[PDB]
Amino acid sequence: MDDDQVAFSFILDNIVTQKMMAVPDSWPFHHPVNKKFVPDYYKVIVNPMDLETIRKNISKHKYQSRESFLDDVNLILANSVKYNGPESQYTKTAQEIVNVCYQTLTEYDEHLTQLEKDICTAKEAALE
Ligand SMILES: CC(C)Oc1cc(C(=O)NC2CCN(C)CC2)ccc1Nc1ccc2c(n1)N(C1CCCC1)[C@H](C)C(=O)N2C
């Protein structure tokens, strides 16, 4: 029944919590940048993103496929390159967050593809 979307967001949340947030020294990417510490951030980064807000989107079942999800994770890296520069050590840990994310998704590719299909058919047929 409704379980398909909840299972999908469940697997997403855990990838974030137990594989992505586990990257060494990734804590600065766990939460929105605190303006108190980086006063220009929200002036040079126009679309902020972080793992906690991604989790909040997961709580609200924002992502129904891998792809809108990867959009937001990739954004975290895109944002680090603009603020910190392409070969900053902070950009490099964001890179690895992006990497372990893709690594996990392909591990569960066939499993997630099933979930993804059932959700789109439900959606597209809910409009009857
Ligand atoms: C400890 C210190 C080093 O950092 C922070 C500390 C704190 C801190 O203690 N907060 C607590 C909250 C609780 N209360 C009770 C006490 C205070 C917050 C942010 C720090 N820095 C930071 C964060 C993110 C980035 C970030 N820095 N950076 C780095 C690149 C250049 C600046 C540093 C950029 C903006 C970047 O992309 N990102 C994502």
Q: Tell me which residue has its CA closest to atom 33 in ligand 1.
A: 38
Distance, CA of 21 to CA of 97 (rounded, Å): 8
Best CA proximity match to 63, nearest among 27, 1, 11, 124:
11
Residues 6+ apart with CB under 8 A from 20: 26, 51, 73, 97, 100, 101
* Ligand 1 near 38 CB (within 6 A): yes
Distance, CA of 44 to CA of 24 (rounded, Å): 26
Q: Are 122 and 6 in contact (CB under 8 A)?
A: no
Q: Tell me which residue has its CA closest to atom 28 in ligand 1.
A: 28
Residues 6+ apart with CB under 8 A from 59: 9, 13
* Ligand 1 near 33 CB (within 6 A): yes
The fold of 1-128 is Histone Acetyltransferase; Chain A (1.20.920)
| Long-range pairs of 1-5 with CB within 8 A, sequence gap ≥ 24 | 4/115, 4/118, 4/119, 4/122, 5/61, 5/64, 5/119, 5/122
Residue 117 is encoded by which pair of tokens?
Answer: 């299909």
Residue spans of the domains in the chain: they are 1-128
* Ligand 1 near 91 CB (within 6 A): no
